[PDB]
Amino acid sequence: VEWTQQERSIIAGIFANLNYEDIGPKALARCLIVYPWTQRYFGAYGDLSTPDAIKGNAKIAAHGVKVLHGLDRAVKNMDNINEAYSELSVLHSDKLHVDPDNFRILGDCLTVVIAANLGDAFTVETQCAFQKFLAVVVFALG
Amino acid sequence: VEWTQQERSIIAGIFANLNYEDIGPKALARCLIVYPWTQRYFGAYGDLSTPDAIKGNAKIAAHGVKVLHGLDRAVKNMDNINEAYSELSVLHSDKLHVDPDNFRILGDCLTVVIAANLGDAFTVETQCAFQKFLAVVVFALG
Amino acid sequence: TTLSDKDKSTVKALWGKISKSADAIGADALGRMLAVYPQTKTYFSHWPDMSPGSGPVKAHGKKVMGGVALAVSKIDDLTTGLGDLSELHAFKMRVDPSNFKILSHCILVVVAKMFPKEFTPDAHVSLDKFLASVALALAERYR
Amino acid sequence: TTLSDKDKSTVKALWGKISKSADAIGADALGRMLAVYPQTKTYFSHWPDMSPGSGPVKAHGKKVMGGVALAVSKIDDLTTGLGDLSELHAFKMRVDPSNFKILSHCILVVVAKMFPKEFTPDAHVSLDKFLASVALALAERYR
């Protein structure tokens, strides 16, 4: 976008704090549980029948961690998420045709997980910059 | 991708045949009536109380035609619509902060009014082209 | 989302006037969904042809407007009314909700185009509400 | 959007643990919607001060969670139960329906922030359903 230094360092701050092994699985699982239509894209990832089974799923969990590494890559590229995401965009929009509303919805899920995890570190200012960030990511995906 | 010849000629053709004073007032008024929260932006325009009033509103009719000339500008500049639209972008997004889904809505009311107008001429392929054009203007406006 | 008395008569009268062209509305609106909004092809990719007027679109367009008719008769309870098809779309097929608005739009366009004089702003508002209540009914079995 | 017996039970169980923080939740949620989604501020433009934790944000936040408290009371028919709140937001104020999802989202974030242990995926699906129902029921008086 047109980042201030404070936003850059808040955003890098959030992803320096997060353990992606914990956050990733939680956020993706939660996406699949709260918005089950997104299960459609994960037919190859084995067992998605109940919630308890979603959380127990190692393939879903690892994929949640890859989504965070994806995000982290966008934090390495804050001024060119578009370019940095081109192949991810070909993949989500040209190949899989995920409706843009879905990127929004997993973004939201992720913000809910990050909020639960960070507690008092999740200030208003922190969320403002985090959302600005996700809004660039979803535009880059679509 | 971007514009096929057949596409630019369909779009040029819609706008050459178009009877603005007919399509513009109709679409805008339809939008205010079908999606009444859009009325919020039109307090200066007087009587918006009934659909009968919206339909008979002279200010609303003039503005509907102004909308259509705003599209003509994208029509004349099909390759540079983002630039052509930057001031209208700032007006719509950075000043009025119209949620980007309303643009989609009005572009929907407009497709319906054009479909009712054109009848047999609003072929499948004409709709593909018009919606691809509209997607480009709404993105331009956001 | 809930329909007024005014809403339900409007849709009935309008459906009164346009039922006789049901198979063709379905087929044109479906045919238009798939060409104008090609992201929607994913759910229909097992068909040998998705092109406008092809046999599959005509055949299915017929069923979709079948379902529309049901809703019209079911208009006081779309939830129970459309239980089974919601089960099919929302649970079994997992059709993304963003898609129900696309087909709804395509149906109002074809209807405007076919019945420009009956497709009044008053009709539009009620038809649109109705197609939204159908969308919501269909979304019941997602979660 | 119909809420199951499980959804209502989940929401009421969650509300039983959280409700003594209702004022703090409303405040923190309104505050964030206005700062994180500054476009919602056009509705609050006559207010002196819209900033996180300010006097007006706190006073209004209480009201807003009083409205959620009200919906938990009316969960079997939000459509009627929030009729007056619809009148105000949809008919008088003409709040764009896209902003309800924003405030809903902000409330879930603050509940998750405040009660991370209570806010499981299971609480999350049902609270998100409930919030959508709240959001639909508030949209009743547009049209």
Ligand code: HEM
């Ligand atoms: C916040 C938005 C999202 C981000 C940042 C994101 C990120 C990613 C990343 C990093 C990958 C792996 C790319 C690679 O290493 O080659 C991926 C793949 C994938 N994403 Fe997403 N994603 C997002 C939203 C979504 C949504 C909404 C869906 C649909 C519900 C989805 C479905 C998939 C699937 C099915 C794959 C991999 C399929 C395969 O090749 O096995 N993603 N995403």
Ligand code: HEM
């Ligand atoms: C298809 C998408 C749209 C197009 C092409 C469009 C086009 C235009 C144009 C050409 C103008 C005249 C600008 C000028 O004089 O500098 C304008 C002004 C305006 N538009 Fe739009 N518009 C669109 C969507 C919307 C929507 C959805 C709303 C409201 C919800 C809206 C509300 C307004 C308002 C309030 C004005 C200002 C008129 C005044 O100052 O009295 N527009 N728009």
Ligand code: HEM
């Ligand atoms: C108003 C909305 C809709 C209505 C009333 C409707 C109605 C119906 C009906 C009556 C059937 C046939 C079920 C049977 O075989 O007994 C059907 C099937 C189906 N619908 Fe829909 N439908 C709607 C929307 C959608 C949307 C938005 C999509 C995805 C873009 C979609 C994808 C399908 C598919 C893939 C089938 C089955 C096709 C097959 O059997 O090969 N539908 N629908």
Ligand code: HEM
């Ligand atoms: C969960 C959804 C919502 C609930 C439960 C809610 C609840 C309430 C309540 C209880 C009131 C005060 C009514 C009274 O005076 O008796 C109120 C007022 C208001 N709400 Fe909301 N609201 C919601 C969403 C929204 C959204 C999305 C907006 C705009 C973005 C909004 C803007 C307003 C405004 C401007 C007022 C009146 C301001 C004033 O009295 O000075 N609300 N809301």
